[PDB]
Design brief:
The structure is cut from a larger assembly and holds chains A (about 250 residues), B (about 80 residues), C (about 100 residues) and D (about 140 residues).
Chain A: E1 2-5, E2 9-16, E3 19-22, E4 41-42, H1 46-49, H2 61-83, E5 87-90, H3 93-102, E6 109-113, H4 124-130, H5 132-155, E7 159-160, H6 163-171, E8 175-181, E9 188-191, E10 196-199, H7 211-221, E11 225-229, E12 240-244
Parallel strand pairs in A: 1-5, 5-6, 8-11
Antiparallel strand pairs in A: 1-2, 2-3, 2-4, 7-12, 8-12, 9-10
Helix pairs in contact in A: 2-3, 6-7
Chain B: E1 21-22, E2 29-30, E3 35-38, E4 45-46, E5 50-52, E6 58-60, E7 64-71, E8 76-82
Parallel strand pairs in B: 4-8
Antiparallel strand pairs in B: 1-3, 2-7, 3-6, 5-6, 7-8
Chain D: E1 32-36, E2 40-43, H1 44-58, E3 65-66, E4 72-75, E5 90-97, E6 102-106, H2 111-122, E7 129-133
The chains are: A alpha/beta (about 250), B mainly beta (about 80), C alpha/beta (about 100), D alpha+beta (about 140).
Chain D binds 4 RNA strands through helix 1, strand 3, strand 4 and helix 2.
RNA sequence: CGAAAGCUAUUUAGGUAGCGCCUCGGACGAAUACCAUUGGGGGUAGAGCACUGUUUCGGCUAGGGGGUCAUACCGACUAACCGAUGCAAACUCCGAAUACCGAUGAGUAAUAUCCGGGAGACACACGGCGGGUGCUAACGUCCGUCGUGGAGAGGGAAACAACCCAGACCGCCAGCUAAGGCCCCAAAUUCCUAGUUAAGUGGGAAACGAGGUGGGAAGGCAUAGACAGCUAGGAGGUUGGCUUAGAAGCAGCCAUCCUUUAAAGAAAGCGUAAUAGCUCACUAGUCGAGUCGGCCUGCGCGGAAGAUGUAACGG
RNA sequence: CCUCCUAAAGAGUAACGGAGGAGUACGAAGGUGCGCUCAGAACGGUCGGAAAUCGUUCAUAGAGUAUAAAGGCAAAAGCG
RNA sequence: CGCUCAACGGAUAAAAGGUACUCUGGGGAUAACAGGCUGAUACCGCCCAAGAGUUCAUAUCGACGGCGGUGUUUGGCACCUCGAUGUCGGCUCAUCUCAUCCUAGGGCUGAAGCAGGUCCUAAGGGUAUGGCUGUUCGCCAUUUAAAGAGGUACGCGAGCUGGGUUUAGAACGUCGUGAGACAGUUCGGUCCCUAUCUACCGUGGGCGUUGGAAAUUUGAGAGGAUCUGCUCCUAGUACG
RNA sequence: GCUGACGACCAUAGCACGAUGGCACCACCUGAUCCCUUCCCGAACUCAGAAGUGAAACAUCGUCGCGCCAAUGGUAGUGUGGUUUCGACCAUGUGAGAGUAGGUCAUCGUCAGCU
């Protein structure tokens, strides 16, 4: 989710990678049965128009902004509970900080982007473009967090790193998660009748060209996940690691 | 005005009262010309001794005692002035 | 199973206040009509009627009501219970002939 | 989210929920019901929360009846709005509930799984409910 | 003697004017009020679908939702109306109680009406009751209706205009009571009878939870040894079929079958990646007398965190 | 200014309460005498159908009433 | 016969504005601050358990829904004050709550250890300095055992300040024909009071204390104080 | 005994189905010169009449299939006084609607005609 915060309004963009899925307009129909203010949310508080009381000298502007972002977060939470995606917060530094003060579920926030431009008139795609660096930083953090999963498997004796070991474990359905270093390719002489993965010599003798792609296919086949770990978090000499089911 | 859902709905006018209904009830003495019922349409119909105005007003044509009865094949409500 | 005891309900035990005050004595008002004579008002103990109502054949067979003496062959016609609490509040018995 | 398809009038007078449910107080369609012991407003979000919960327990093996339909719009005034200036917009639809009314009935399912599903529905409801068997009279 | 804070109108909205309400005088004299009996019309409370809508389930089908060859005529086959069932200010097949308009009749009553002199008032408030509005929020607001205050002291509610009792002409070191009370502050029971509570509940607070405690209608089992404990077994087709990496009683979907039986579920839990393993249900044995689980009712328990000091019986 | 509800079954009764209309029309769309009965559904029938016109059977108004709504309307207040 | 005298009981045949240059009579009958009532909203807690958690609802989190507590946000009302209750922030000086940030004691843990995560108990102490901005806040830098959440007229101007807001000058953008206007900006712009009572901090006089006096004293009670880092050793041991 | 006219009453009177009636009466019926009819039509209205028929209609009788009517009891509400946890409850006086048992193929008046 992309929450776009200003002192004047709030937008909500739901995105898949580099493209926007929707913009949460007044014709979105995920907003139909809402009990909070639907997006786009105008900041039509009493002080913004001059009605009500508490004239400017009371200096309640910060508290008005904090409560407005509290209402924006109420709408965000009411839409999140139905689809539970992570959210990126976009706005001014003080705006996203006021939002983090007030957010009811601040553990679902992955990144904040404060240098994005044209937050009111800007296109939904344009904002998604400006969040790409933060979305890739989060993808890198989600790979640094897999190092601890690999260490947990290693300490529980549920991690196989030999290529033959990983082949056997993935083939008989024991592979829970596969961790492959980026671009790691290996050719080998594989015969699943005896399950012997011996190293190839020239990849011109009847061997399988991508012995590691066969591992990836088997792990995906047996209801596992494949994580492709970048070269600087995964070791060059230990380029594969499989968290087994037992 | 957060949620901004309010807004003017101008229907704040009405008409003056018309003071309709039964003016003289059953068993009462009445004199000719006295209005018995002011009504819209014939909620009550003019029986013997009772006249009906252009307003559908029922009035006594002659003195006596006003009487209400449901008569006829239509089960209509009739008002009559019995000579009593 | 199909025999129940009742007590005569006099004209001073009838009405809104009396029936409410009679139900506080764990008695259920009831009327016996039908046949070829005037209806008779009786009163049944709540615990006997509640027990008799559990038997699902009680509703589809000829019943016997012995009002301390005179005895009547009846069939239960209506049964109003409490809308919320659910206990029986009045029973209609049709005299069979 | 039950709601009438179209209404004669947008807004309604508050009214006064009083009295007992002398109608809709007996199990009429199912073989097993859940009636109310208290009165109040049963909004259309509680209809679908109690109805989704029973559906997940019967698992296409029973039939659920909803004896309660919300057909009464409840207006609400937004924040930062003075009194007057009209009557607020409609935000939701309640059904008036009186002590005695069933809210749901089941049929075609083990009496243990039906009790276990109506128990889970009462948890999402604002009423003190009870469990009632369909009878002859 | 004794109001009003209302209606109507108003460059009116905190002003004023007519009417309503007060007083004084005159006229008139029961024409007035209360109650009993009695003549009326009503569409409210309640209720109910007969109309206007709305609503759920089933049956039933012209229209619609789909699939070979097939413009081969478009072929084979997979809304309504009836019956149950709810709801509505601007729905009513119905329909009170009161209220109102009359008649007759007693008794009681410092009546009603009209005419004229003098006003004041046209900021009302709270507590009930019926509503609109609001959030069945507000010591909120706007109506209707009653009581009180206003303009009303006295007693009670600790203190507390509007709540309860009760209407102060004055004086008394007389008596009886109302509301409320009777262990002490502080007048009057450490009064009597039968119970309940163990929480200082009484003397704030809900959904919900619990094996508190009392009572009431029923039930199931039991010296053909009941409940609990302990001992032994708890099995064989079979790893039911499917699905699934695996699904072996125990992820999930479809059945609940048979056999040795005294008994043993195609399993009520724990456990395993799946198995394994530990229990349970169930049966036999030991001991010996009552016991088991639901329902309803009363009073209790937890839920229960705030700011100067106990500080949520006035003590 | 009119109609309904709020409005608590006589009248009346407020809100920046909920809903709608009016600031006209007609010398016939008035008077009278006489005469007539609608909306729909089905069946049959050239164009012609779902529905034009015709004929038949049910059909207390499910129509109409110049104009909103309410109350009325067969002796029709409806139609010649 | 002649009225959108339609503000429709019609003020004249005949009529717009500005004022921060302002002024008078009044009103807490009526707004802005603070209090009060209320608690929709907010915050906090609980109930249910779809799910996430590789398995596994309940280590941890809690979708759809339900029930409360607080006064604590944004509000509602107009009860108090308009014959005056000074606005935000800073400084100084505080006082209380506990829904606990650190330190203390515990249960569970997806608790090996080290570190944590939750929840219970606990208010005795302690709980930074700066850059930016008038800021409270917030971001950031560097620390710290920790840099708590709140009430106190959003504590505290007869204690200080006066940066912002909010007088009169001037300008820009914008709106207006204009006088002028702007929860738009910008430069500038008088903060009085010798303390009577209560309170508090100190320091005396009087009388009393069963004759008076000089000393020494007991202690009903009251206040103060209560924080914590790091290094070594145990021991590179337990655990891994 | 039956028929017709006009009334009372307005479903316990209606609907439906079946049966009975032609001496009078009624109704269909014949004809369209005449009076009078048709935005065309002797259909209706109107006239002149008596060959046919009770077929329709109408009247009467029968029934419970529908409709209608409808208790007793209970419930809801409610005036007054009191209490309340605001839902209600107590005293007293009232008292429905729905539904049930049940009832229903009306009941009378004036006048005339055949018998």
């Amino acid at each position: 989710y992309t929450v776009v915060l200003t002192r004047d309004k709030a937008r909500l963009i739901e995105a898949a990678n580099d493209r926007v899925v929707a913009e949460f307009d007044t014709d979105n129909a995920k907003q139909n049965n809402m009990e909070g203010i639907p997006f786009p949310i105008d900041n039509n508080g009493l002080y913004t128009t001059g009605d009500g009381g508490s004239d400017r000298s009371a200096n309640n502007e910060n508290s008005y902004l904090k409560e407005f972002f509290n209402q924006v977060d109420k709408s965000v939470q009411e839409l999140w509970g139905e689809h539970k995606m992570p959210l990126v917060i976009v706005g001014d530094v003080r705006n996203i900080s006021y939002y983090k003060e007030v957010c009811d579920r601040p553990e679902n926030i992955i990144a904040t982007v404060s240098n994005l431009t044209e937050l009111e008139d800007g296109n939904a795609q344009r904002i998604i473009d400006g969040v790409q660096d933060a979305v890739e930083g989060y993808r890198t953090s989600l790979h640094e967090a897999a190092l601890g999963e690999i260490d947990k498997a290693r300490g529980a004796n549920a991690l196989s790193t030999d290529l033959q070991d990983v082949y056997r474990a993935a083939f008989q359905g024991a592979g829970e998660t596969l961790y492959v270093r980026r671009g790691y390719i290996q050719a080998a002489k594989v015969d699943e009748d005896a399950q012997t993965l011996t190293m190839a010599d020239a990849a011109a003798d009847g061997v399988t060209d991508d012995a590691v792609g066969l591992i990836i296919e088997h792990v995906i086949n047996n209801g596992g996940k494949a994580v492709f770990m970048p070269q600087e978090m995964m070791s060059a000499d230990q380029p594969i690691a499989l968290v087994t089911r037992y | 005005a957060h949620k901004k859902a309010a807004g003017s709905s101008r229907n704040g006018r009405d008409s003056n009262p018309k003071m309709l209904g039964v003016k003289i009830f059953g068993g009462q003495a009445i004199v000719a010309g006295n209005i018995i019922v002011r009504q819209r349409g014939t909620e009550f119909h003019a029986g013997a001794g009772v006249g009906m105005g252009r307003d559908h007003t029922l009035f006594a044509l002659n003195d006596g005692v006003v009487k209400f009865a449901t008569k006829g094949k239509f089960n209509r409500r009739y008002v009559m002035v019995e000579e009593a | 199973h199909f025999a129940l005891n009742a007590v005569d309900r006099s004209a001073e035990l009838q009405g809104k206040g009396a029936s409410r005050r009679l139900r506080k004595q764990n008695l259920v008002p009831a009327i016996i009509y039908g046949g070829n004579e005037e209806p008779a008002s009786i009163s049944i103990k709540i615990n006997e009627l509640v027990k008799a109502l559990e038997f699902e054949a009680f509703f589809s067979h000829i019943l016997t009501i012995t009002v301390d003496g005179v005895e009547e062959q009846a069939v239960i016609k209506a049964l109003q219970r409490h809308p919320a609490k659910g206990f029986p509040m009045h029973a209609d018995f049709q005299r069979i002939v | 989210m039950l709601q009438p398809k179209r209404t004669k009038f947008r807004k309604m007078h508050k009214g006064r929920n009083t009295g007992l449910a002398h109608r809709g107080s007996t199990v009429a369609f199912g073989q097993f019901g859940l009636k109310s012991l208290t009165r109040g407003r049963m909004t259309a979000r509680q209809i679908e929360a109690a109805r989704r919960t029973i559906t997940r327990k019967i698992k296409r093996g029973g039939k659920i009846w909803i004896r309660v339909f919300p057909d009464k719009p409840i207006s609400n005034k937004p924040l930062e709005v003075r009194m007057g200036k009209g009557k607020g917009p409609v935000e939701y639809w309640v059904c008036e509930i009186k002590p005695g009314k069933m809210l749901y009935e089941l049929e075609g399912i083990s009496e243990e799984l039906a009790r276990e599903a109506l128990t889970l529905a009462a948890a999402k409801l604002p009423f003190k409910t009870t469990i009632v068997k369909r009878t002859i009279m």
